[PDB]
Amino acid sequence: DRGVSTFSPEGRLFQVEYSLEAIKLGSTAIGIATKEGVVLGVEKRATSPLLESDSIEKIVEIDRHIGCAMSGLTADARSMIEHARTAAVTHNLYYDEDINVESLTQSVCDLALRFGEGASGEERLMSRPFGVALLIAGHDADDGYQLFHAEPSGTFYRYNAKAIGSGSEGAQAELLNEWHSSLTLKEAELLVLKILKQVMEEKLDENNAQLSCITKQDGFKIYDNEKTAELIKELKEKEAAE
C-alpha cells in the first residue's frame, strides 16, 4: 500500500484530499454573517420517511455565543464538538471571560492534522483525517459577528457567507450575488431558506430543513419548526411578488 501521511507528487496530502471528497457528498449547510447576527441553515436529508427528523442534529451549540453547522460524515463531528465545548468552557474557567470565536476555531483546527501511524512529530494518534467540514458562527466583543469554515486540512477561512455540502458551488455562486454588508437578520434568514430551497432534491419544508442563529443579545438558538414554517410561508409570498 502507501502510508497515511504521504504527499502526492503535487504537494498535497492524499488523505486530506480524499477527505474533501467525502464532504462533497454531505448534506448542504449554509451560513450568512450580518451586523444583526449570524444565520446557520442545513438540509436534514432524512434517508427514509420513518425516521424522526428532529433527531437529526446537524446544528449544535458550542457556548452561548458560538454555534456550528456540519456537513459530511457527521459522526466524525462529535468529538470535534466535544473538544470545542471543552475548549470554550475551559477558557472561561481560566480567564473569567468568553473565548473569542477565532481562537475557538483555531483550537478545533489543531486537531485536524493530528493523524498518522506512530509518526515523527509528537504523540498524535488518530487513524485518518476527519471527514466533515464545519461552519462555526459566533459573536465576541473584539470582532463582532463571525462565520468560519473549518476544514479537515486544518485551515479555516472567515466568510461573510458560505455554503458547504453537495449543493455548494451552486449555492456559493448564489451567495456571491445576494450577500451585501447591510443585510438584516430577517433577510439572511430568508436568503438561507431560499438557497436550500433551490439546491435540495426534496421540497423544502420545516421538517427537512433547520435554521438557527447567534446574536449578542439572546445567544445561539435553534429555531423550532413553527418559527421556521412561518419564515418559509413569508418567503413563498415574497417570491410570488414578481
Partner 1 sequence: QFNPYGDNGGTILGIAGEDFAVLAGDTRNITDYSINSRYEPKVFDCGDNIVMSANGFAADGDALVKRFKNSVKWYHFDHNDKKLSINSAARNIQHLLYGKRFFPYYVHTII
Partner 2 sequence: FRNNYDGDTVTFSPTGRLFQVEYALEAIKQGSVTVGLRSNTHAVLVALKRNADELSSYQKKIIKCDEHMGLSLAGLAPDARVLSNYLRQQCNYSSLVFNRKLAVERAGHLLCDKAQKNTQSYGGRPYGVGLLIIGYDKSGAHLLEFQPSGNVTELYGTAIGARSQGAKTYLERTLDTFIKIDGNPDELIKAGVEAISQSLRDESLTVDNLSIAIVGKDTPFTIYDGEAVAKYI
Partner 3 sequence: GSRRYDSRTTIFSPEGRLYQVEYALESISHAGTAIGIMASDGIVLAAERKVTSTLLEQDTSTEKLYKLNDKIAVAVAGLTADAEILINTARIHAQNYLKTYNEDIPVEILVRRLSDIKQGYTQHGGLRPFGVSFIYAGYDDRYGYQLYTSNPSGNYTGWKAISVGANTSAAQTLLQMDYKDDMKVDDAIELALKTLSKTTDSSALTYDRLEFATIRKGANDGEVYQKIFKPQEIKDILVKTGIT
Binding site for partner 1 (CB under 8 A): 93-97, 100, 102-103, 142
Shortest distance, position 217 Cβ to partner 2, whole Å: 25
Give Cα 239 to chain centroid, integer Å.
27
Q: For the chain, report the end-to-end CA distance as a whole number of angstroms.
A: 59
Please, which residue, 3 or 170, has the CB nearer to partner 3?
3
Which position among 46, 119, 185, 235 is part of the footprint of partner 2 (CB under 8 A)?
A: 119
Q: Which three cell numbers stand for residue 183?
A: 443585510
Shortest distance, position 117 Cβ to partner 1, whole Å: 30
Q: Is 151 exposed, middle or buried (0-12, 13-18, 19+ CB in 10 A)?
A: buried
The entry of partner 1, partner 3, partner 2, none that residue 7 binds, CB within 5 to 8 Å by partner kind? partner 2
Instruction: Decide if residue 181 touches partner 2 (CB under 8 A).
Output: no
Please, which residue, 100 or 168, has the CB nearer to partner 1?
100
Instruction: Decide if residue 10 touches partner 2 (CB under 8 A).
Output: yes
Q: Which H helix or E strand runs over 40?
A: strand 37-43
The entry of partner 3, partner 1, partner 2, none that residue 103 binds, CB within 5 to 8 Å by partner kind? partner 1
Longest CA pairwise span in the chain (Å) = 62
Give the C-alpha separation, 215 to 186, whole Å. 12
Shortest distance, position 179 Cβ to partner 2, whole Å: 7
Closest-CA residue to 111 (of 133, 135, 85, 130): 130
Contact 58, 71 (CB under 8 A): yes
By rule CB under 8 A, what string of x and - marks binding of each residue 34-73 to partner 2? ----------------------------------------
Q: Is 155 helix (H, G, I), strand (E, B) or coil?
A: coil
In the DSSP assignment, the letter for residue 76 is G
Q: Is 95 helix (H, G, I), strand (E, B) or coil?
A: helix
By rule CB under 8 A, what string of x and - marks binding of each residue 130-169 to partner 2? -------------------x---xxx-xxxxxx-------
Please, which residue, 7 or 95, has the CB nearer to partner 3?
7
Give the C-alpha separation, 43 to 79, whole Å. 22
Rg of the chain on CA atoms, in Å:
18
Residues contributing to the site for partner 2 (CB under 8 A): 2-3, 5-13, 109-110, 112-113, 116-121, 149, 153-155, 157-162, 172, 175-176, 179
